[PDB]
Amino acid sequence: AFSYSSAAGGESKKILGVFFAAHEYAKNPEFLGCVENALGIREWLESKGHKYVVTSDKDGPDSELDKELADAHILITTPFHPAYMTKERLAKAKNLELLVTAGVGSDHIDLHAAAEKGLTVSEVTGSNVTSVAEDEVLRILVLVRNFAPGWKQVSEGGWNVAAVVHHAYDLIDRTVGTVGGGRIGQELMKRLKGFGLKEMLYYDRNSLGAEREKELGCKRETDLDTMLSKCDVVVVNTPLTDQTRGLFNKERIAKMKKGAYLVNNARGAIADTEAVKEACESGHLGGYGGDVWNAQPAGKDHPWRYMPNHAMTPHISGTTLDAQKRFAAGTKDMIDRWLKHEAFPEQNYIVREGKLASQYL
């Protein structure tokens, strides 16, 4: 009922948010990361005379996302329920100036297309990198120690120790490799310190400190194939870039030790769907697990749901209640800064001044 705002010329800005529905779970106000509570920023936007419109309806061209997209200045996405911003969707977005990811990973945006339009793309760098590091250890131990079939077995009334431990091992004196030595890569190695690994290995374009490598008890592998062929466990910790799409194909998976484990809480598309299914069926992989899929939601018939020895979940690790707090705060901050014509922290920029952040090249 108020026509103006505290912005230039009192132009009312429209902020569009796409979040999953929490339905009854939204009764917990700590549950910020959902369409119902919308990061708890509605009153703070409405009180500036700005418009705040949110939806969980992002799929197909009849979507609330496509309706509302035309006159939106600011788009908030979340990786857990990601608005896929194609060249077409960006081109219809006539007022769009800022794309902010409530989480980490902005690959659900056409970054090359956003860059060409001079749009700004940002994410809450660092906000759930500890949460994913914890979940990666979870997935390693669950696959190595064969937890899931055992939990299934006793929940359905059975008792057969052998049907579980015929495929259960200890992590001690095994070799773990992280593809990526970024924030999550490093938080993983910090958390694998006490497990008495043979070696902790990382592959990245960037050497860490010699001092950092000592701190993390890790060693750099120059060649990826050289790292993979030493590893009992492989963890994916890169963004989804043009370099990293389908990086874990037939060829690259056969380069891994027989019965080795593949954990991916980075992005599904970094691992070829059919290649992971088959190597799980053959046993060339001891198992595959992660919260991330090449389509979000994953179609009912995504094979990663039904393949053997999998530790799959929906996209949960970076959106625990504790993670939601951090990326909510970071999202509000960047919208605050944008309205104040203030630079974001340099690390939060994925696309700025028509250029992609070096880690997406």
Ligand X SMILES: NC(=O)c1ccc[n+]([C@@H]2O[C@H](COP(=O)([O-])OP(=O)(O)OC[C@H]3O[C@@H](n4cnc5c(N)ncnc54)[C@H](O)[C@@H]3O)[C@@H](O)[C@H]2O)c1
Which active-site residues does the annotation give? 128, 267, 296, 315
- Decide whether 177 or 181 has the Cβ nearer to ligand X: 181
CB atoms within 10 A of CB 161: 10
Give the one entry of ligand X, a copy of itself, none that residue 181 binds, where binding means its C-beta sits below a cut-off of 5 to 8 angstroms depending on kind. ligand X
**Among residue numbers 246 through 305, which ones bind a copy of itself (CB under 8 A)?**
291, 297-298, 300, 304-305
- Decide whether 283 or 354 has the Cβ nearer to a copy of itself: 283
Specify whether the CB–CB gap between 118 and 351 falls below 8 A. Answer: no
Q: Is there a binding annotation on residue 243?
A: yes
Rounded to 5 degrees, φ, ψ at 279 are: -60, -25
- Cβ 343 to a copy of itself shortest distance, Å: 29
Specify whether the CB–CB gap between 206 and 181 falls below 8 A. Answer: yes
* Distance, CA of 245 to CA of 269 (rounded, Å): 6
- Decide whether 23 or 214 has the Cβ nearer to a copy of itself: 23
Give the one entry of ligand X, a copy of itself, none that residue 266 binds, where binding means its C-beta sits below a cut-off of 5 to 8 angstroms depending on kind. ligand X
Spell out where the chain has E strands. 14-18, 51-55, 74-77, 98-101, 120-123, 176-179, 200-203, 218-220, 233-236, 260-264, 285-290, 310-312, 349-352, 355-356
Which one of 9, 61, 155, 340 is in contact with a copy of itself (CB under 8 A)?
155
**Among residue numbers 219 through 278, which ones bind ligand X (CB under 6 A)?**
237-241, 243-244, 265-267
- Decide whether 285 or 350 has the Cβ nearer to ligand X: 350
CA distance between the termini of the chain = 46
Q: Contact between 317 and ligand X (CB under 6 A)?
A: yes
Rounded to 5 degrees, φ, ψ at 355 are: -120, 145
Q: Which residue has the tokens 């001079």?
A: 118
Which one of 47, 86, 160, 206 is in contact with ligand X (CB under 6 A)?
206
Which one of 114, 176, 291, 312 is in contact with ligand X (CB under 6 A)?
291
- Cβ 297 to ligand X shortest distance, Å: 15
- Decide whether 105 or 289 has the Cβ nearer to ligand X: 105
- Cβ 336 to ligand X shortest distance, Å: 22
Specify whether the CB–CB gap between 277 and 300 falls below 8 A. Answer: no
Among 245, 287, 294, CA closest to 270 = 245
Q: Is there a binding annotation on residue 267?
A: yes
Beta carbons within 8 Å of 143's beta carbon, 6+ residues apart: 233, 261, 263, 286, 287, 288, 289, 309, 311
**Among residue numbers 53 through 112, which ones bind a copy of itself (CB under 8 A)?**
80-81
Kindly calculate the radius of gyration of the chain based on its CA atoms and give it in whole angstroms: 22
State the residues that interact with ligand X by CB under 6 A. 104-105, 128-129, 132, 180-185, 204-206, 237-241, 243-244, 265-267, 291-292, 315, 317-318, 359
